[PDB]
Amino acid sequence: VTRLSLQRANVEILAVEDKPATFSVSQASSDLGETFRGIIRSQDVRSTDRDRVKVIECFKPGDIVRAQVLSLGDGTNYYLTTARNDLGVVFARAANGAGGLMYATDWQMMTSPVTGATEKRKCAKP
Amino acid sequence: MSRLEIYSPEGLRLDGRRWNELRRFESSINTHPHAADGSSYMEQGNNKIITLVKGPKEPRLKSQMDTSKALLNVSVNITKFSKFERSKSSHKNERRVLEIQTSLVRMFEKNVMLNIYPRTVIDIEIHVLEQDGGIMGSLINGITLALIDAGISMFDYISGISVGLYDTTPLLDTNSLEENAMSTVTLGVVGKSEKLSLLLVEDKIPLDRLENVLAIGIAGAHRVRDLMDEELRKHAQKRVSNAS
Amino acid sequence: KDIEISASESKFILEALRQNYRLDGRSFDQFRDVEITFGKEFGDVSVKMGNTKVHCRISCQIAQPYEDRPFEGLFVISTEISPMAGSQFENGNITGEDEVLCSRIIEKSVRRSGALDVEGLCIVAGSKCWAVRADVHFLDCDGGFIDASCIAVMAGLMHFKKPDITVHGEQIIVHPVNEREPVPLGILHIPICVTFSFFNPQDTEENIKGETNSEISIIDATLKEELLRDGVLTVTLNKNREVVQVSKAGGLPMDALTLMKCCHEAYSIIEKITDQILQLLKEDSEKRNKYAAMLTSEN
Amino acid sequence: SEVITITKRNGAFQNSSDSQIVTPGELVTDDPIWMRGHGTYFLDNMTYSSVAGTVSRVNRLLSVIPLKGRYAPETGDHVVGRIAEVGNKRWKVDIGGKQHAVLMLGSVNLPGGILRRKSESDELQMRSFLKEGDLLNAEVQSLFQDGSASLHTRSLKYGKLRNGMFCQVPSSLIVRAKNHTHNLPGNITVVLGVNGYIWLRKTSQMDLARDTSSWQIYSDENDPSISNNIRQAICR
Amino acid sequence: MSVQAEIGILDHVDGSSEFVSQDTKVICSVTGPIEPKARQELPTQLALEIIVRPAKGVATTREKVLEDKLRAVLTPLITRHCYPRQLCQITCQILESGEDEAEFSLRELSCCINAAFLALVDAGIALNSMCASIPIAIIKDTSDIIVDPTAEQLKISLSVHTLALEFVNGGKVVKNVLLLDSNGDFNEDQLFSLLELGEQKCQELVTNIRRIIQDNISPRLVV
Amino acid sequence: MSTFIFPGDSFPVDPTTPVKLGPGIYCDPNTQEIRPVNTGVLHVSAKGKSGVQTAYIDYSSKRYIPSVNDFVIGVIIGTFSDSYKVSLQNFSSSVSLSYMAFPNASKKNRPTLQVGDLVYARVCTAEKELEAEIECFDSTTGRDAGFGILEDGMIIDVNLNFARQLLFNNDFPLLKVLAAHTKFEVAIGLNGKIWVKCEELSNTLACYRTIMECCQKNDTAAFKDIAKRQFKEILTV
Amino acid sequence: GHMSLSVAEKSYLYDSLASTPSIRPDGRLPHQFRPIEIFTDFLPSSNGSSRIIASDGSECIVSIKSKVVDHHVENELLQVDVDIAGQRDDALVVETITSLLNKVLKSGSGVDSSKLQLTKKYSFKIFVDVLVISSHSHPISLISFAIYSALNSTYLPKLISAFDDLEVEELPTFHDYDMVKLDINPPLVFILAVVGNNMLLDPAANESEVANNGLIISWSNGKITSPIRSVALNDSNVKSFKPHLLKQGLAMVEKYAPDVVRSLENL
Amino acid sequence: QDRRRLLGPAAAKPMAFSNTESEQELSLHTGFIENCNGSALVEARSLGHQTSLISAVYGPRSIRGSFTSQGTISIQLKNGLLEKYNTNELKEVSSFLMGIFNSVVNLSRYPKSGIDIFVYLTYDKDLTNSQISSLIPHCITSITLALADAGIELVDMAGAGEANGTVVSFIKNGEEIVGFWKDDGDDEDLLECLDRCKEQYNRYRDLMISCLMNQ
Amino acid sequence: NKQRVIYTSPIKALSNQKYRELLAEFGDVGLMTGDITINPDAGCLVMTTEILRSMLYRGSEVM
Amino acid sequence: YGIVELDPECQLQNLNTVLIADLDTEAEETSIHSTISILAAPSGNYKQLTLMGGGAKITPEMIKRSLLLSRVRADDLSTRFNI
RNA sequence: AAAAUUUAAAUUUUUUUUUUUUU
């Protein structure tokens, strides 16, 4: 996750999986701003309650999301979605790196072991 | 010590001009139809300028965009063959030039009806070809063509002229030889009025002449926008008489 | 990086001029009070006009002259803005317009005008001369920088001294500083610039074809004052009543008869402030010499 | 029997119905009864032109029509657009005028027609039906607060071009009539835009239909059967 | 201890401080948190951009490193998680040298840290600890060690040293070292001796400072 | 002689206390410890408050940090559709305000305000890390149309702690002496903004010059004569 | 590039020009050029001037200023310097065309620097100074044409004193009114393009867009010469090429080249 | 002068001195730069002239500009240590470079993706007691090997051969030409200029494919 | 079939009957009136006769 | 040189404060914050030393350890290529 | 004498140091 808008969410592409797991991470350096970046729009986070969408309650900066390509979009970014019960948040550290590692409580929620603190993320089905 | 003769006691200048006289003054309209809808050519003596105007149109970037009015870009091209002695380096970020690039903007922030051209771009292209001194007011008179050359919305004519001072005596329409010889002032004069757009003094001036000095250039400046007008009009007659 | 002001606040000041008021407490044609204070170094000064604060520095060193004028020494003024003095500014934009509007003035105010004898920088012709340097720093803006940097540079030239020199071909003998005294510099004339600040209370046309001159001009725009002004004009003069530069580069249209009537009032202003510098240069050097009297009797 | 026109002229930079013709800065009158419209500004009486153009006095309305300027967009006009950009569900497209027109996402003829209804997946395929620089027939709907206007294709007759060649002209010489598609002997068709944009193509059956499949409205295809006797007749 | 300072002496800027030690006058300015640029943001922590203007000349490479080591020191001073997607531009002005800029940069590096520390207090940004820096030299000929030398003593100095420490618990516990700028010739053995005064002295510096802050700002504070 | 503090001091209170956190203190997300991280004076909330106390540091600033349920004054800077662009302080980040967060909430009804207006609004919802949001009309207004767009007036910038004293404090002597001359309006913005409109611009300049001077001198006891003198400075005429 | 065209054209344009009875969009013969206008001798401060007008309104002016120099301390006796309006110095098409014409006018390749020679010690530094107002083309072969006329419109002041400065080392002297024309044989440049099995001459911008690849062929002295470069116009349609087609174009240039030259060798 | 670098005191000057069919040969190496994804190393030595140069790949990098259907190539020529070729002399070659690879690379495989090519004219001997024209064909070879190392879709091992101030680039084992470069030489020597270029191309491409397939 | 549909009336109050009825019934219904439009991009549309005529002249893509 | 401090959480079976030198490998260069860089001539000499302490504390002994590791890594390279 | 009749206006960032023009 790169930046959180009220409109939308912005990420950069890092790693592509494959079909019949088998992956392909990009070997690029993001510190150049090199890599391909994409955009998740906030209504495209999920389809259940797709109108009254609260974006902060699913994402924070720097976090890992199993997301599906929607389409190409522009040349600048991508059209992207997470709108499934198996998709969404993979992993982040607490308070965006300011704390320890966090585990998805449900498919729908996430906590942290040592802390006793939870946060709302649109977690993936594990 | 100059081995030459600045101004005669018999009233004459280098070509024999009087102190209240002009060079040959020639404009032209629609010099480049295939290039832009603003295209005008100046000869004021050997000051020769190609003047080009682009707009009102879409920007290159949405960053450079306003939702209120137009923008105005000034791009000055001084060639290395503009003078007698060929200049070595290029000028394209020279801090002398950028001043004028600032200058014509604020001179022309206030003729353009900016509000009625929003979200669009006006670009003014300059090509200085042959340089004869009096260089500042040479430009402005070329500008006033080029905006009318597309017929952009405006208030008025705007005239420009450098007028020099040999010791007591004003000199309408100096040249670069005279420019390096004495003190000069250029006036950016608006229409028929007594109000100024441009006023720029580099040289050192005794105070007491200056009111009189300023009182000189208006009659010159009024004869400028005079000669611009009919010269456009005789062009303007040439359209519809052969269009229709 | 954009200053945002309400149009409600825009009308407010514009009303205050329409009832002959301005927010600072000065008159329209009144200038701020100037605090000049020197550091211990020569060519060291802190100059302060209320809110606007500046600092500059004069130095010199040895170099060869150009081929261009092989007679004369070398000199240039740096005026690099730091965004310290206000968050509007880029980190050292030498290509911004207002910077150039600060630049070319002081370029013409000093260099093309020649207050300073560059020929008195010629140590030896074509071999070794002086490279005199003027770094202008801005501290905090309330406008009047180009008038402040007008002053603070010319303040600095009347406080710098250069050390002692002896020539034998290549054997060029720069002496120790404290045995052989530093030597001040030659000023041909003292220029003082004046900012003029312009406000149409009307539309364009009543300035254009409204024959009635109705345009208010004030001195030393404060920060909020400066953000709404319509034309920009600076003149510069001396004590010998000659006009150094004038620059109205566009903006609002403006009557000629105003400008002479403007520039006369400049004269009485700048003269009093000029002499205030002149005493303080003396009086500090008097305080230098009275403390030099408080030194040799002490030592 | 030549290659190039080389004719020479050396020693010179250059070779060198009545109505009111007015200038900017110029007074027209100060009768207060007149109304003040385009090309006109004023101070309470003083009627002041702003362009090089003509006084138009309409019955109490005085206004100044210029002679020089870009194309003026007006509604209901039949012009040609070159695709500038793609927006959110918007497109940008050159008129040749001051600014781009805009073109709504559902403003276009869908393949299969209205039985194809709306879909949010259509914005995932904006580039499918349209992309940059392409030429088409467009119908001027209505405007904005400034004078920038928009387009649509409310017919089969409007749509993306093929089967020929573009040319362009000044907008002035194109005369107005009640009709704009024209069919010429040589089995070919001019599509005169108003704005100054001119497309030629071979006469279609739909063109023939004007005077007596639907899935091909974003194709880059032509009729494959194009004779040179078509092609050389285009150039004439 | 011929040091002295000013707080809150600019106008349009968030944090401002004049630090004046024995010979060098340096003012620092702090503006933040404010709108960051496009190329400058961090999704998590606080972005920092630092400008030092010399007294003489313009910004070159000699300035650049004194900037960049000063970048390293401030980064743990700032509670950087508190201001995501933000920017604080901080700017320092060298006004007085007090040291040969051609030959040295030592005192200024001590000075500017001691300058910028106080303008942040003016700025009132979430910080972590307390700090101090001093210049320390060792004489070539005498082979002795002076805390806070002079430039003529720098001429006969063998090795020039700047120590930056992190002070907590009443500023008393050395929480960490920030910077140790060892320059000139030195060995093992001098170094632990070289800390051992600056172990005391920077605390002795801050012991003055703790007072000064409250004296300047509690009348700016309300009761 | 206070509960003065530095970032990096010993925190005074025992750890086993139920304590609502005030600003100025920071809890570690990494090591769970809690420390004072700003400069100034602590003020301990006294006991009895449900057995739950509260710490807060008096710190000084001018650069306002957007926080919730806070009355600020803003400037309309852009018409991002559905949702305004509004700023609160120059060079800071812009704020987003709904077009619908308004006391006659009506989604078919699009309101009227234009770029460059002054509006009174309260911070509704603002994460530390997210695009912050405000409201004029609120639920915490409780259907109150008490905020709103302003008319012309005049707005002056001060530092924040002063503006708290304008809001939080009746002992603040300012509103007394000002009411003791003329009658007028006042809007208080926690972004250091103070919007005043009088019946007169003349008194508004008198209102202007005092507040510039008083907040500069920051000596509330002295403000009796200092305020009244500017009237004489206006009544110089 | 300059333009953005539509794909449906791009087929038809690539269709019609790759006809075996090949068809231009304006339908010229395959070896034709387009009509132009040629003006000179109008900047009387210069040693020579030039002004040329394209059919699409592409526009340039090349100036001639001279300078006397020692021809021993300097190698390059002839300098080209180019300006395109609307572009940075740093751009590509600027610098390549700039560096090209220097090679085209190397001092003894097609340039007869003996005619430039003033003394046994001195000669004439010349400045090919170029200002392009506008282009819609790969502009280069236009630009040579005005320069050819520019050298045919250039007069130089007359030597008075002698020219052997090894012993006596005289400072050379010129008369103040008497100028002589520079006798010179300047070269010419032609833009080519390859479509399918056809080779058009003077590619217009549409023709320049659709091409598989193109050439630049240096003409001088009534023949083909160097510098010769294969050259891309676009980069969306770049295809390779049979060499006999490359061998075809050379005489295809050459048996129509001097007729263009004689049209301009016409005074 | 330049306030961004250390260029010494100005009045110094560098030091001055005065006077008091053959084989070409290669040494080709890949996979030695970890910043890149494609690297290639080239040694060359021929008869008075020894030359070494580095070709560097960055791709596919993102394009902040806009949409394209396909890829875009960017090529930089930079002076190394000793030999200083002219600035405008450089980019002309960079122009001539891009034309050939636009008949090589499957850009259609790479929408909205960039290609960065850095060429370091690192060190050259010319001990011989159109000086850039003698180094053209080795560039193309040096690029091709690095572009194979990033593994990008390339149609052909295309190469150029040189015959005495003349550069001709081939494909299809020489059965088509993809890039033509000519300086002064003779007149109508073209037919021999076919040959000696072709056989070096016939040499070089075999040297290239040995460098990879044997690894 | 995700299609749009026009329900016509000569009277506002005819629609006001049918609107709140269908608004209770299916909800996702746009109302178009000279007095009040509600929910312009809804799937179902209820509007008076001339509005169709008006948006048949200038060609609403709503159609 | 680099000195780090360790999490109990991060272990995989096959305080705690570790010195690393010969630093490389972006992940290292991101995450090491207290660092040491040293110049030294092989007879125990020292041209400079460079401490940026931004992560861990610094012991007096990691100092001496790095000093012990200084005079090795330098002196080998003095003797490695014998120029 | 009733009855009623009409609208719809556009949102979130890509660039190369300052000489130097004829007493």
Curated annotation (Swiss-Prot), chain A:
Remaining remarks: Present with 5550 molecules/cell in log phase SD medium.
Family: Belongs to the CSL4 family.
Highest taxon listed in the record's lineage: Eukaryota
Subunit-structure text: Component of the RNA exosome complex. Specifically part of the catalytically inactive RNA exosome core complex (Exo-9) which may associate with the catalytic subunits RRP6 and DIS3 in cytoplasmic- and nuclear-specific RNA exosome complex forms. Exo-9 is formed by a hexameric base ring of RNase PH domain-containing subunits and a cap ring consisting of CSL4, RRP4 and RRP40.
Span of the entire protein shown here: 143 to 291 of 292
Annotated localization: Cytoplasm; Nucleus, Nucleolus
Function: Non-catalytic component of the RNA exosome complex which has 3'->5' exoribonuclease activity and participates in a multitude of cellular RNA processing and degradation events. In the nucleus, the RNA exosome complex is involved in proper maturation of stable RNA species such as rRNA, snRNA and snoRNA, in the elimination of RNA processing by-products and non-coding 'pervasive' transcripts, such as antisense RNA species and cryptic unstable transcripts (CUTs), and of mRNAs with processing defects, thereby limiting or excluding their export to the cytoplasm.
The protein's name: Exosome complex component CSL4
UniProtKB/Swiss-Prot annotation, chain B:
Cellular localization per UniProt: Cytoplasm; Nucleus, Nucleolus
Molecular-function GO terms, alphabetical: RNA binding
Entry keywords, A to Z: Cytoplasm, Exosome, Nucleus, RNA-binding, rRNA processing
GO cellular component: cytoplasmic exosome (RNase complex); exosome (RNase complex); nuclear exosome (RNase complex); nucleolus; nucleus
Gene Ontology biological process: exonucleolytic trimming to generate mature 3'-end of 5.8S rRNA from tricistronic rRNA transcript (SSU-rRNA, 5.8S rRNA, LSU-rRNA); nuclear mRNA surveillance; nuclear polyadenylation-dependent CUT catabolic process; nuclear-transcribed mRNA catabolic process; nuclear-transcribed mRNA catabolic process, 3'-5' exonucleolytic nonsense-mediated decay; poly(A)-dependent snoRNA 3'-end processing; RNA catabolic process; RNA processing
InterPro entries: ExoRNase_PH_dom1 (IPR001247), ExoRNase_PH_dom2 (IPR015847), ExoRNase_PH_dom2_sf (IPR036345), PNPase/RNase_PH_dom_sf (IPR027408), Ribosomal_Su5_D2-typ_SF (IPR020568), RNase_PH (IPR050080)
One Pfam family of this chain: RNase_PH_C
SUPFAM superfamilies xref list: Ribonuclease PH domain 2-like, Ribosomal protein S5 domain 2-like
Family of this protein: Belongs to the RNase PH family.
More about this protein: Present with 5150 molecules/cell in log phase SD medium.
Protein name: Exosome complex component SKI6
Taxonomic lineage from the root: Eukaryota, Fungi, Dikarya, Ascomycota, Saccharomycotina
Gene: SKI6
Swiss-Prot record, chain D:
Domain of life according to the entry: Eukaryota
Predominant location category: cytoplasm
S1 motif domain boundaries: 74-154
Entry's Gene Ontology BP terms: CUT catabolic process; exonucleolytic trimming to generate mature 3'-end of 5.8S rRNA from tricistronic rRNA transcript (SSU-rRNA, 5.8S rRNA, LSU-rRNA); nuclear mRNA surveillance; nuclear polyadenylation-dependent rRNA catabolic process; nuclear-transcribed mRNA catabolic process; poly(A)-dependent snoRNA 3'-end processing; RNA catabolic process; RNA processing
GO cellular component: cytoplasmic exosome (RNase complex); exosome (RNase complex); nuclear exosome (RNase complex); nucleolus; nucleus
Keyword terms of this UniProt record: Acetylation, Cytoplasm, Exosome, Nucleus, Phosphoprotein, RNA-binding, rRNA processing
GO MF, any single term: RNA binding
Location(s) in or outside the cell: Cytoplasm; Nucleus, Nucleolus
Modified residues (N-acetylserine): S1
Subunit annotation: Component of the RNA exosome complex. Specifically part of the catalytically inactive RNA exosome core complex (Exo-9) which may associate with the catalytic subunits RRP6 and DIS3 in cytoplasmic- and nuclear-specific RNA exosome complex forms. Exo-9 is formed by a hexameric base ring of RNase PH domain-containing subunits and a cap ring consisting of CSL4, RRP4 and RRP40. Interacts with LRP1/RRP47.
Stated family: Belongs to the RRP4 family.
Other comment: Present with 4840 molecules/cell in log phase SD medium.
Protein name (record): Exosome complex component RRP4
UniProtKB/Swiss-Prot annotation, chain I:
Places the protein is found: Nucleus
Function: ATP-dependent RNA helicase required for the 3'-end formation of 5.8S RNA. Cofactor for the exosome complex that unwinds secondary structure in pre-rRNA. Required for nucleocytoplasmic transport of mRNA. May serve as a chaperone which translocates or normalizes the structure of mRNAs in preparation for export. Component of the TRAMP complex which has a poly(A) RNA polymerase activity and is involved in a post-transcriptional quality control mechanism limiting inappropriate expression of genetic information.
Oligomer status and interactors: Component of the TRAMP complex (also called TRF4 complex) composed of at least HUL4, MTR4, PAP2/TRF4 and either AIR1 or AIR2.
Additional remarks: Present with 12500 molecules/cell in log phase SD medium.
Family (UniProt): Belongs to the helicase family. SKI2 subfamily.
Protein name: ATP-dependent RNA helicase DOB1
Species, as recorded: Saccharomyces cerevisiae (strain ATCC 204508 / S288c) (Baker's yeast)
